[PDB]
Structures are given as structure tokens and as C-alpha cells.
Amino acid sequence: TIQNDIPDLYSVFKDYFPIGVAVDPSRLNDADPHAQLTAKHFNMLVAENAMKPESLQPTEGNFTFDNADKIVDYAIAHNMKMRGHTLLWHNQVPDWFFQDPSDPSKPASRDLLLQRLRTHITTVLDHFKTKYGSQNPIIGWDVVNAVLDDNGNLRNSKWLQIIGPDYIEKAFEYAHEADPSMKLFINDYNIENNGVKTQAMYDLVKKLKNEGVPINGIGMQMHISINSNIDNIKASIEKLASLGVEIQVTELDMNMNGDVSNDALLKQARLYKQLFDLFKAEKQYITAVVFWGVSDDVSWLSKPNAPLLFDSKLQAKPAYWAIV
Ligand SMILES: O[C@@H]1[C@@H](O)[C@H](O[C@@H]2CO[C@@H](O[C@@H]3CO[C@@H](O)[C@H](O)[C@H]3O)[C@H](O)[C@H]2O)OC[C@H]1O
């Protein structure tokens, strides 16, 4: 059971930006405590998995939008906005995309993979536009996800192998043509550490935007840890924001590195407080902050963990009170 009388999390940030959460379609029933927590504290939703490529087109031409639509319906019912995650990634994408259909032992050509990407992106965006119309809660999409490797080079996924470096520009082009009302984002992790990957994201977006690619913003996943440096996060936000794009904190959670002790929870609270003070200070750039999971018990991180503001019993943690 949840705490019904404590402050609604997102309301505390009404003058800064919406506060969202990533959800599972199986946790949306009115009597489900996770759903109650979702509707109470957030005014933005994201599909943790239901809108990924494999979740939308498991086999070629066979689109499965039921779970995604269930989340969209829920968002509409609770007056929540949504982020679309994600049109392209190297994980949770079916092998068929990259295979020659007449000889699955061979790879698809650059033209065939591009056509498939175009069809996927266009069908996905057209689905939400045609089914929901003006009521579509999705305000933007992570057009490409995690396209950089640890060293800042372009990740050598099958997309890069088969098409080449311009597959990124093509994805944005296809999304923009399908629905110009959508804000288009390039999303990634570790770009908040002000290291080589932050610089690489900055260089890539600067290059593409200067070439006319319709990139509207950068999503900083923010899968931080109990040892993350606030100064580096601030420097990263400033650097990326200098490109004239929106910044959204898209998959916020805190890896405790196995230490879920009471002392660690207090340290977590202090860090989350500093983090949100930073976000508020940077409100002229940040247009959304989304947590990757409703509560600790449903977090994607391996156990033991305590990454969010609500614990495994769905109760507000010290971090929640520090921020509110
Ligand atoms: O942007 C990335 C996120 O999308 C990513 O989210 C996690 C992706 O893996 C999910 O776990 C899979 C769910 O589907 C099952 O069939 C698989 O067996 C699981 O591995 C997890 O639920 C998401 O939270 O996190 C990393 C980000 O870079």
C-alpha cells in the first residue's frame, strides 16, 4: 500500500519541468499499488520496453501495438505526457531487420536496411498519430538510442556495419517526415560524466545539426551511481546545452554498487538533492526529468539495489523527502 497523503512528486516541480516514469504495461490496473504510485507522483510516462523495436514489430510487417497502446491509453486517462522510447537501438531489435530475407545467412543491404528503418519509423509514428490524433500524449521520441561506444566512437552495431555512419541522420530524417510535430532526441548514457563520451556526443550533434539534421534535443539517460560527481554532470549539461538543443533527463536511477545500507540511503538522499538542485538551476535547458522505474522492487538493475525514490515496499525513501 502506498502513502496517499504525501506530496505528489511532479507537483513540486510544476514550475520547472514535468517529472515522468518508465512503466510496464502489466502494472497499470487501478488496484495495483504500482499503478497508484504512478498516477500519484508523475505527470509524464515512458514505456520501459513496450515501444522498443522488437516490442512493436517482432517479425516483418507484423506490428504488435497492444502493450504500447495500453500505456498510451493510461497516460491519456491520467492527463500525462509521454516520451517515445525508442525507434532504433542495438538491443531489443529483431534479427530479421539485418538479414537478407532470401538468404538469412547473409546481411541485408544498406538500401534494404534503410527502407526497413523508414517503414518501421513511419509505421510507428503514423500508428500513434492516426489512432490518437490530437490526443496523442507523446511529445517526442528517442529516435536513436546509445549510438556511441564507451570511447566516444560510433558503436559498431549492425546498423553501422550495414549502412555506414549516416544511418543516424537517416533515422532523424524519416522520423521528422513521418511526424513534424514530434521533438526528436538522440539518447545516451554516460554522457553526463564530462569525459570522452560527453565530448563525442557534443561533436556528433554539432556536426549533424550543422548539416541540417532535424535533431531537437539530447536525452541524457542519467543512469548515475552513488559515486557520481555533480560537477561533471553540471559541466556535461552546460556543454551539451550550448548546441541549442533541449536536454531531457530520460532514465534517471542511482546504482548503489551493492550498498543498500541505511547510511548509503542517506548518502543517496544528499546526492539526489544536489542533483535536483542542479536540474532546477538548469531549467532553461531541461524540459523533462524521467525516472527509470516506479519503485526499487521493479528496477532493471540487478540485486541488491535501491536506485529510486520509492523503496521495495513502495514507501518514500530519504531521497524523496530530501527533494520535496
Ligand atoms: O536506453 C536503454 C534502456 O532502454 C534500457 O532499459 C532496459 C532494457 O532492458 C530491459 O530488460 C529486458 C526486458 O525484456 C526482456 O525480454 C529481456 O530479457 C530483458 O533483458 C529492462 O527492463 C529495461 O529497463 O536500459 C539501458 C538504457 O541504455
Side-chain angles (χ1 to χ4, degrees), residues 48-49 52 54 85 89 92 145 187 189 221 223 251 292 300:
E48 185 175 10
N49 291 293
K52 286 170 178 175
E54 69 173 21
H85 180 78
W89 191 29
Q92 289 175 265
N145 197 45
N187 193 49
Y189 61 97
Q221 292 182 188
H223 283 298
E251 310 185 11
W292 208 245
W300 72 299

Coordinates of all heavy atoms in Angstrom, one line a residue, residues 48-49 52 54 85 89 92 145 187 189 221 223 251 292 300, ligand 1:
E48 N 8.9 1.4 -20.6 CA 10.2 0.8 -20.3 C 10.7 -0.1 -21.4 O 11.9 -0.2 -21.8 CB 10.2 0.1 -19.0 CG 11.6 -0.4 -18.5 CD 11.6 -1.0 -17.1 OE1 10.5 -1.3 -16.6 OE2 12.7 -1.3 -16.6
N49 N 9.7 -0.8 -22.0 CA 10.0 -1.8 -23.1 C 9.1 -1.9 -24.2 O 9.4 -2.3 -25.3 CB 10.2 -3.2 -22.5 CG 11.4 -3.4 -21.6 OD1 12.5 -3.3 -22.1 ND2 11.2 -3.5 -20.3
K52 N 9.9 -0.5 -27.8 CA 11.2 -0.8 -28.4 C 10.9 -1.6 -29.8 O 9.8 -2.1 -30.0 CB 12.1 -1.7 -27.5 CG 12.6 -0.8 -26.4 CD 13.3 -1.6 -25.2 CE 13.9 -0.6 -24.2 NZ 14.4 -1.3 -23.0
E54 N 11.7 -4.6 -31.1 CA 11.2 -5.9 -31.0 C 9.8 -6.0 -30.4 O 9.0 -6.9 -30.8 CB 12.1 -6.8 -30.1 CG 12.1 -6.4 -28.6 CD 12.9 -7.4 -27.8 OE1 13.7 -8.1 -28.3 OE2 12.6 -7.5 -26.5
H85 N 10.0 5.7 -26.6 CA 11.3 5.1 -26.5 C 11.2 3.7 -27.1 O 10.4 2.9 -26.5 CB 11.7 5.0 -25.0 CG 13.0 4.3 -24.7 ND1 14.3 4.9 -24.9 CD2 13.3 3.0 -24.3 CE1 15.2 4.1 -24.6 NE2 14.7 3.0 -24.2
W89 N 17.9 1.0 -31.8 CA 18.8 0.6 -30.7 C 19.5 -0.6 -31.2 O 19.0 -1.3 -32.2 CB 18.0 0.4 -29.5 CG 18.8 0.2 -28.2 CD1 20.0 0.8 -27.9 CD2 18.3 -0.5 -27.0 NE1 20.3 0.4 -26.6 CE2 19.3 -0.3 -26.0 CE3 17.2 -1.2 -26.7 CZ2 19.2 -0.9 -24.8 CZ3 17.1 -1.8 -25.4 CH2 18.1 -1.6 -24.5
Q92 N 17.2 -5.3 -28.2 CA 15.8 -5.5 -28.3 C 15.3 -5.0 -29.7 O 14.3 -4.3 -29.8 CB 15.1 -4.8 -27.2 CG 15.2 -5.5 -25.8 CD 14.7 -4.8 -24.7 OE1 15.3 -4.1 -23.9 NE2 13.4 -5.0 -24.4
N145 N 19.1 5.4 -30.0 CA 19.5 5.2 -28.7 C 20.9 4.5 -28.5 O 21.2 3.6 -29.2 CB 18.4 4.2 -28.0 CG 18.4 4.2 -26.5 OD1 18.5 5.3 -25.9 ND2 18.3 3.0 -26.0
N187 N 19.5 9.8 -27.6 CA 19.5 9.4 -26.2 C 20.8 8.6 -25.9 O 21.1 7.7 -26.7 CB 18.3 8.6 -25.9 CG 18.0 8.5 -24.4 OD1 18.1 9.4 -23.6 ND2 17.7 7.2 -24.0
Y189 N 23.7 7.1 -22.5 CA 24.2 7.0 -21.1 C 25.7 7.4 -21.0 O 26.4 7.4 -22.0 CB 24.0 5.6 -20.6 CG 24.7 4.5 -21.3 CD1 25.9 4.0 -20.8 CD2 24.1 3.9 -22.4 CE1 26.6 3.0 -21.4 CE2 24.8 2.8 -23.0 CZ 26.0 2.4 -22.6 OH 26.6 1.3 -23.2
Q221 N 20.5 9.8 -20.4 CA 19.8 8.7 -19.6 C 20.0 8.9 -18.1 O 19.1 8.7 -17.3 CB 20.4 7.3 -20.1 CG 19.9 7.0 -21.5 CD 20.3 5.7 -22.0 OE1 20.2 5.3 -23.2 NE2 20.9 4.8 -21.1
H223 N 21.9 7.3 -15.9 CA 22.0 6.1 -15.1 C 23.2 6.3 -14.3 O 24.3 5.8 -14.6 CB 22.1 4.8 -15.9 CG 20.8 4.4 -16.6 ND1 19.7 4.0 -15.9 CD2 20.5 4.3 -17.9 CE1 18.7 3.8 -16.7 NE2 19.2 4.0 -17.9
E251 N 16.3 8.6 -18.1 CA 16.2 7.3 -17.5 C 16.9 7.3 -16.1 O 17.7 6.4 -15.8 CB 16.9 6.2 -18.4 CG 16.4 6.3 -19.8 CD 17.0 5.2 -20.7 OE1 17.6 4.2 -20.1 OE2 16.8 5.2 -21.9
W292 N 13.8 5.9 -14.3 CA 13.7 4.6 -15.0 C 13.1 3.5 -14.0 O 13.9 2.6 -13.6 CB 15.1 4.2 -15.5 CG 14.9 3.3 -16.8 CD1 15.3 2.0 -16.9 CD2 14.3 3.7 -18.0 NE1 15.0 1.5 -18.1 CE2 14.4 2.5 -18.8 CE3 13.7 4.8 -18.5 CZ2 13.8 2.5 -20.1 CZ3 13.2 4.8 -19.8 CH2 13.2 3.7 -20.6
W300 N 15.3 -2.3 -13.2 CA 16.0 -3.1 -14.1 C 17.4 -3.5 -13.6 O 18.0 -4.5 -14.1 CB 16.2 -2.5 -15.4 CG 17.2 -1.4 -15.5 CD1 17.1 -0.2 -14.8 CD2 18.4 -1.3 -16.3 NE1 18.2 0.6 -15.1 CE2 19.0 0.0 -16.0 CE3 19.0 -2.2 -17.2 CZ2 20.2 0.4 -16.6 CZ3 20.1 -1.8 -17.8 CH2 20.7 -0.5 -17.5
Ligands
LIG1 O1 18.1 3.1 -23.2 C1 18.3 1.8 -22.5 C2 17.1 1.3 -21.9 O2 16.1 1.0 -22.9 C3 17.3 0.1 -21.0 O3 16.1 -0.3 -20.4 C4 16.2 -1.7 -20.0 C5 16.3 -2.6 -21.3 O4 16.4 -4.0 -20.9 C6 15.1 -4.4 -20.2 O5 15.2 -5.7 -19.8 C7 14.8 -6.7 -20.9 C8 13.3 -6.7 -20.9 O6 12.9 -7.6 -21.9 C9 13.3 -9.0 -21.6 O7 12.8 -9.9 -22.6 C10 14.8 -9.0 -21.5 O8 15.2 -10.4 -21.1 C11 15.3 -8.0 -20.5 O9 16.7 -8.0 -20.5 C12 14.9 -3.6 -19.0 O10 13.6 -3.9 -18.5 C13 14.9 -2.1 -19.3 O11 14.8 -1.3 -18.1 O12 18.3 0.4 -20.0 C14 19.6 0.8 -20.6 C15 19.4 2.0 -21.4 O13 20.6 2.4 -22.1

